Structure 1
């Protein structure tokens, strides 16, 4: 087993990452960050949900895996096999230490690494599920369930962005039709009026 999160909850220390200075770190419980039908086009999943943080706190690697599996298997039960794509948007890069007793005292109590923890800011996104506009009241439930495997306060926000892109939902398909945006797998490539002109003629071929 291990300790409670209560012990390692607040952002107390400077970010002490896995380096050539800190070696002897165990592997994180969250390894698979993005799952569902990840190999999906931008157009076919227009809606995007986010679960946004509210406290300045450390979230466990184990809590991120638990929240991912919970959200996953609700969205699998809700919309099925190929009707969503989850990303976990916090990579646990903070080593937490533990001064292990087992007869010493406090003669030089600098800890050995226990595990990895994902340090968060206020308004920073934890997870995000992109799907159809049909599955609007499935995403919110999925992320509302995911909240329970976390400490502190978590808000939910159905975003103005077209899926996992950097552009608003009511500019996107007009900007594709005027060839300012290029479908690029799960994302979109914004190509402005700045390169050579062979770029422009090959675009309008």
Structure 2
């Protein structure tokens, strides 16, 4: 019953979020965004593969959930059940409209909301899998299988960051040994040389 994505594919409109003015939106069907062993520290998954995009287009929430399931299925088949962590780094906020014809015509044509849609830039990361450093080909194959659930051209890039952090994977170990970083779950905490030094003597206590 939903129109094809090639109708609602280009970033044609102003971004039109679910708000006080556009209410009555049917709910986005991707609602789980992070999967796998999402309760695992930064230290035990060092590898991070990003499905980056290569077009300025619109991905549907249907396609985001289809690619989530297509990645998760291959990851729990290949890397074991909890040896990975996928996260979908797009949330569909733009909602799209449907002009229903049943006779009026184009008189007063402004659609009811039909669905939700994520707008993506050239180089904005769609999905990302955090895994161990020997599960490289499995994550490339999982992202390559999930690319067929999207329109357009997506590329696959294995980053030099330490998983889901903004710090580089070569100097992450030196920084965490120098105690400028602190593990606090799936992320890491950055500590400047700017605090009150009771925090300093608490860390080096």
Tell me the TM-score normalized by structure 2. 0.99
> Displacement, 1:161?
0.1
Unaligned runs of 5+ in 2: none
Q: Residue 109 of structure 2 aligns with which residue? A: 109
> Displacement, 1:104?
1.4
Q: Residue 85 of structure 1 aligns with which residue? A: 85
CA distance in 2, matches of 1:145, 1:82: 19
1:18 paired with 2:18, answer yes
> Displacement, 1:48?
0.5
CA distance in 2, matches of 1:156, 1:169: 18
Cα displacement string for residues 23-62 of structure 1 (whole angstroms, at most 9, x for unaligned residues): 0100111000001010000000001100000010000000
> Displacement, 1:134?
1.1
> Displacement, 1:93?
0.2
CA distance in 2, matches of 1:110, 1:169: 50
CA distance in 2, matches of 1:104, 1:85: 51
> Displacement, 1:70?
0.3
CA distance in 1, matches of 2:149, 2:91: 17
Q: Residue 143 of structure 2 aligns with which residue? A: 143
Q: Compare 100-109 and 20-29 and name the one that shifted more.
A: 100-109
> Displacement, 1:103?
1.7
Cα displacement string for residues 82-121 of structure 1 (whole angstroms, at most 9, x for unaligned residues): 1000000010000100111122111111110001011100
Q: Residue 130 of structure 1 aligns with which residue? A: 130
CA distance in 2, matches of 1:26, 1:103: 26
> Displacement, 1:8?
0.4
RMSD: 0.5
Q: After the TM superposition, list the runs of 4 or more consecutive aligned residues in structure 1 that deviate by more than 6 angstroms.
A: none
Unaligned runs of 5+ in 1: none
CA distance in 1, matches of 2:167, 2:82: 24
> Displacement, 1:179?
0.3
Q: Residue 192 of structure 1 aligns with which residue? A: 192
CA distance in 1, matches of 2:2, 2:115: 10
> Displacement, 1:189?
0.4
